[PDB]
Write a protein that binds this DNA or RNA. Structure first.
Length: 300
RNA sequence: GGCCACGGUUCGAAUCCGUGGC
């Protein structure tokens, strides 16, 4: 029974949950989840948690992502992709200069409204559910930031490019907005998430074509997970304490590794075991004041 | 853990997580 994260590949077609089920089918379990959904029409990196690993999934939602996208100008749908049933073709007569101009005009920060077809919630129901019932929701915008755009390739009306964006950014909205700026409209047709944080699509595995063994081996152990984030070590004695509630104090730490305030921290004992993730209560300077407050404990 | 309500995450998560209650 392994416990950790699995960098999987979601083929174009099935939903993010269809991925989980596939996994939990192979590993014969139920403790399975993902740390970030991918629209069915898209494909790429999908962080999948196994057993105790599901507990750390929430930390991947804050990682930068890298997508390769291909939108089609002059196309518009209600879902912002090619799976929409209400399409509207529009005449596109813009110069490649006007296109690239619009594309890079988005590098930076802007307020992105979430597509009505999102998993966001309004009043106990999911937007995509409400949208299908005929009620479109207009949620408040989210200041999203586009870090950079590269490998732009223009072919007639099919524009394509790579982009790195902050967490919570919708590539569907990005395209729709670029199509607006261009007046002809735009719709995402192909979307490929090349990476989430440091997890590439190369390090990924197509759980749908692999066997249990193959899937098992590719699971990263809680220790090796969340490579980013500060890691502190505690004297082998204090371990039993931590595994039984108990906050962490100065006299329990053996190594520091500077960190912030409410910043998450990894807690290792001496034998080299992840004991728990905890939020700092201070900074990182030189009395038994609780210096770290538990945030999650692992009974692997 | 389980059973309810509410959120989260790039859309068909009841199924994963997180918050409240028991």
């Amino acid at each position: 029974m392994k416990h950790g994260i699995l960098v999987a590949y979601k083929p174009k077609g099935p939903t993010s949950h269809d991925v989980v089920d596939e996994v939990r089918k192979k590993l014969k379990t139920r403790k399975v989840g993902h740390g970030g959904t991918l629209d069915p029409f898209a494909c790429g990196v999908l962080i999948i948690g196994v057993n105790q690993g599901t507990r750390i999934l929430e930390f991947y939602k804050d990682l930068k992502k890298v997508y390769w996208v291909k939108m089609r100008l002059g196309l518009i749908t209600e879902t912002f992709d090619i799976t929409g049933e209400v399409v509207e073709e529009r005449e596109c007569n813009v110069t490649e200069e006007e296109i690239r101009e619009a594309i890079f005009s988005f590098v930076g920060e802007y307020d992105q409204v979430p597509p009505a077809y999102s998993a966001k919630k309004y009043k106990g129901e999911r937007l995509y559910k409400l949208a299908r019932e005929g009620k479109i929701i207009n949620l408040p915008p989210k200041r999203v930031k586009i870090f950079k755009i590269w490998d732009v390739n223009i072919e007639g009306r099919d524009v394509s490019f790579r982009v790195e964006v902050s967490p919570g950014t919708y590539i569907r909205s990005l395209c729709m907005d670029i199509g607006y700026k261009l007046g002809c409209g735009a719709t995402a047709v192909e979307l490929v998430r090349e990476s989430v944080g440091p997890h590439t699509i190369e390090e990924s595995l197509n759980v749908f074509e692999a066997a249990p063994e193959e899937i098992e081996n590719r699971i990263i152990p809680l220790e090796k997970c969340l490579e980013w984030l500060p890691r502190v070590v505690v004297h082998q004695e204090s371990t039993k304490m931590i595994l039984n509630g108990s906050q962490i104090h100065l006299e329990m730490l053996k190594e520091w590794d500077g960190f912030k305030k409410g910043e998450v921290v990894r807690v290792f004992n001496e034998e080299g075991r992840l004991l728990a993730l905890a939020e700092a209560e201070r900074n990182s300077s030189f009395r038994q004041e609780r210096v770290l407050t538990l945030r999650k404990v692992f009974q692997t």
